[PDB]
């Protein structure tokens, strides 16, 4: 029936093409894309205002 | 700053854009190597 959510993770050597597949899937399913780096953060407010 | 804080003024970049009056100047960040990476909000994330 209806649309459904799910979580996933990818891992491997840097520069294998990961993010590129991300956006390609986003234009495959037609869902909207939005990158969000979180490297090195400690500000929970960034995740919650 | 947010402009709701008292005394807020636009960030440095807007001033350079205001000053050079063109859309495509040649910004020159200087001395990137010693940027202050502290607990008070690390600019190095802001540069990205
Ligand atoms: N199999 C592939 N198909 C398409 N692009 C690839 C492939 N392998 C590497 N790339 C290129 O590698 C670069 C980095 O890929 P990406 O996963 O988006 O970033 P990172 O690799 O840092 O995670 C991209 O510009 C992408 O085009």
Cα–Cα nearest to B27, from B17, B18, B39, B36: B17
Q: Are the Cβ atoms of A40 and B48 closer than 8 angstroms?
A: no
Q: Give the closest-approach CA distance of B43 to chain A in angstroms.
A: 12
φ, ψ for residue A4, nearest 5 deg:
-140, 145
Sign of CA pseudo-dihedral B28, B34, B38, B44: positive
CA-nearest of B33, B31, B27 to B12 is: B27
Judged by DSSP in three states, A16 sits in coil
Residue-wise DSSP of B1-48: --SSSTT----HHHHHHHHH-SS--------GGG----TT--HHHHH-
Q: Determination technique for this PDB entry?
A: cryo-EM
**For A15, left (φ over 0), alpha (ψ -120 to 50), or beta?**
left
Distance CA B6, CA B13 (A): 20
């Amino acid at each position: 029936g209806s649309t459904q959510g799910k979580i996933l993770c990818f891992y491997g050597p840097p520069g294998v093409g990961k993010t590129s597949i991300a956006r390609s899937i986003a234009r495959a399913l037609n869902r909207e894309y939005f990158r969000f780096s979180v490297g090195g953060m400690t500000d929970v407010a960034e995740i919650k205002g | 700053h947010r402009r709701t804080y008292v005394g807020a003024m636009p960030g440095k970049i807007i001033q350079c854009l205001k000053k050079t009056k063109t859309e495509n100047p040649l910004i020159l960040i200087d001395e990137v190597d010693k940027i202050g990476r502290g607990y008070q909000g690390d600019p190095s994330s802001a540069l990205l």
